[PDB]
Paper text:
Survival of motor neuron (SMN) functions in diverse biological pathways via recognition of symmetric dimethylarginine (Rme2s) on proteins by its Tudor domain, and deficiency of SMN leads to spinal muscular atrophy. Here we report a potent and selective antagonist with a 4-iminopyridine scaffold targeting the Tudor domain of SMN. In order to understand the structural basis of compound 1 recognition by these reader proteins, we determined the crystal structures of compound 1 in complex with SMN, TDRD3 and UHRF1, respectively. In this study, we identified some low micromolar antagonists with a 4-iminopyridine scaffold targeting the Tudor domain of SMN, and compound 1 shows >4-fold selectivity over other tested methyllysine or methylarginine binding domains.
In addition to triple-ring compounds 1 to 4, SMN also bound to two of twelve double-ring compounds, compounds 5 and 6. Both compounds retain the imino group, which pinpoints the importance of the imino group-mediated hydrogen bond in the compound binding and is consistent with our crystal structures of SMN in complex with compounds 1, 4, and 6. None of the single-ring compounds bound to SMN, which may not be able to provide strong enough π–π stacking interaction to hold the compounds.
Residue numbers in the entry: 88 to 147
The structure:
Amino acid sequence: SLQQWKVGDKCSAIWSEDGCIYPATIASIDFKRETCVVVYTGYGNREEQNLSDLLSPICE
Ligand SMILES: Cc1cc(=N)c2ccccc2n1C
Ligand SMILES: Cc1cc(=N)c2ccccc2n1C
């Protein structure tokens, strides 16, 4: 990908606990590890995602 994900980007992510997709924002990126932390919109919980697993915001 030419464009890089950055902190503050809106995305969708698969929640580890149920396998369903939810809207999220990137809070941090580990440039070497190609991982990030996402904050789930409305729930407010956060968890690690590989950058390669982030989706553009669903149904937007
Ligand atoms: C029920 C529920 C509880 C959560 N704490 C949560 C967090 C992040 C994304 C989805 C989530 N859902 C669906
Ligand atoms: C739908 C979509 C897919 C992409 N891979 C992407 C990449 C970079 C910027 C916008 C993007 N959008 C909007």
